[PDB]
């Protein structure tokens, strides 16, 4: 009914009333959030945080894929940005808690397995390329799935951060976001075997290495002193490759 | 020839004055209840 009223006003020429009815309609195209509140649906589908953690598998698979994917009408640019933000926040929780356990590289991408509250959680992240969209691939179905799992992961991150004690949502700065901080754009403040492997080391990443996966792994298992080339983005501990206080350096050039 | 020219002129006139925009049985449509 609201959409019919918006079209009715637009066909009359009342642009101000059309805009007011649109902000009442709360389109995802502008909001960046799902069109409908699905809180009660998530609550009834998963009456337990354990069940939420058990479907968090497909939740993360969806969200990482659509955080990497280009923008369409079914899933807008702001919604993709929110997907990326939620994935990065979940990655920060994993880094802080050292919940990440095992990893794998395949012709399919990269597999991550973590353990949150006794539940094994797997997901596949594609390699940073231009993923092909060929054939009769319908993004509206995947858009509905994306909205559901965005709400689900948002509530999951809230509960995780509240349980650990850190405040949710983490502060996020558009300046470093634009300058390309990716995971380095979030500062985590509080509220008022795993972490030893690379702890007392210092790592540098060359321009030919996967920055997001390598950084996720190293932050999850300890390395607190990581740098990379300026092209890779902000947040590097040291940008100068000449700096002699670097222990290990990653190369994939012939 | 002459008929074609007259038809083209009349079509242009109509476009200038009015613009360019211009089973079988019946059942009650199922509306929302």
């Amino acid at each position: 009914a609201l959409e019919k009223k918006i079209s009715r006003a637009l066909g009359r020429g009342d642009v101000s009333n059309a805009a007011r009815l649109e902000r009442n309609a709360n389109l995802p195209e502008k909001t960046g959030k799902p069109r409908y509140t699905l809180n009660h649906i998530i609550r009834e589908r998963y009456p337990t945080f354990q069940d939420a953690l058990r479907d968090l598998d497909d939740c993360l698979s969806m969200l990482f894929l659509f955080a990497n994917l280009p923008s369409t009408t079914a899933v807008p640019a702001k919604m993709i940005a929110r997907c990326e933000r939620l994935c990065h926040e979940f990655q920060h929780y994993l880094i802080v808690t050292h919940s990440l356990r095992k990893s794998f590289l395949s012709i399919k991408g990269i597999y991550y397995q973590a353990n949150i509250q006794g539940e094994d959680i797997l997901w596949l992240v594609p390699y940073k390329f231009n993923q092909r969209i060929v054939g009769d691939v319908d993004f509206r179905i995947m858009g509905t799935f994306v909205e559901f799992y965005m709400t689900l992961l948002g509530f999951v991150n809230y509960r995780l951060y509240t349980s650990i004690g850190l405040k949710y949502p983490p502060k996020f700065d558009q300046v470093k976001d634009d300058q390309g901080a990716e995971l380095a754009a979030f500062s985590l403040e509080g509220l008022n075997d795993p972490s030893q492997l690379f702890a007392n080391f210092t790592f540098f990443l060359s321009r030919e290495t996967p920055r997001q996966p390598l950084e996720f792994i190293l932050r999850a298992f300890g390395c607190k002193r990581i740098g990379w080339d300026a092209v890779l983005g902000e947040g590097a501990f040291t940008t100068d490759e000449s700096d002699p206080r670097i222990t290990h350096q990653i190369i994939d050039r012939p | 020839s002459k008929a074609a020219k007259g038809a083209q002129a009349k079509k242009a006139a109509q476009a200038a004055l009015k613009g360019v925009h211009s089973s079988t049985t019946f059942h009650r449509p199922k509306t929302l209840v």
């Binding site: - | 020219k5 007259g6 083209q8 002129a9 242009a12 006139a13 200038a16």
Partner: protein
């Protein structure tokens, strides 16, 4: 074979040769066309003559675009009777009227050097021009030397 002449007046600025050709060739087939422009400056005098192949087409076009409001200009489209069409009216039709810098030509003609022996016999002639000035200044009472 009945040619048809239409006179179009109160033309908006920018309703020139090619625009006229396109529009009235959408209406029909244009054989000849000539806007009226000033020789001094290449500016339209806001009227033009279009000579169509078909008289019926000309009549239809005039009836459709007679009192048309275009850019604050109520056009004037009227068919000229064949008895009143002056035989050489489309003398510069289908040609490209050019804008001549007459002032710039007169200038560089003035600064073009030339032997001023004739200009000095003309100095004598402009001295008799000064004689005419003197005779009109006798009523004035102003005497001037050379």
């Amino acid at each position: 074979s009945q040619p048809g002449v239409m006179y179009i007046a109160r033309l908006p600025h920018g309703f020139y040769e090619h625009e006229l050709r396109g529009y009235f060739s959408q209406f029909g087939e244009i054989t000849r066309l000539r806007v009226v422009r000033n020789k001094k400056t290449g500016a339209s005098r806001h009227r033009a003559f279009i000579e169509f192949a078909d008289a019926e087409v000309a009549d239809i076009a005039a009836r459709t675009m007679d009192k048309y409001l275009l850019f604050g200009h109520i056009l004037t489209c009227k068919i000229v009777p064949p008895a009143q069409v002056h035989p050489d009216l489309f003398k510069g039709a289908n040609r490209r009227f050019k804008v001549v810098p007459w002032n710039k030509m007169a200038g560089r003609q003035l600064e073009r050097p030339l032997s001023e022996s004739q200009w000095q016999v003309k100095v004598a002639k402009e001295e008799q021009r000064r004689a005419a000035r003197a005779e009109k200044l006798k009523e004035m009472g102003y005497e001037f030397e050379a």
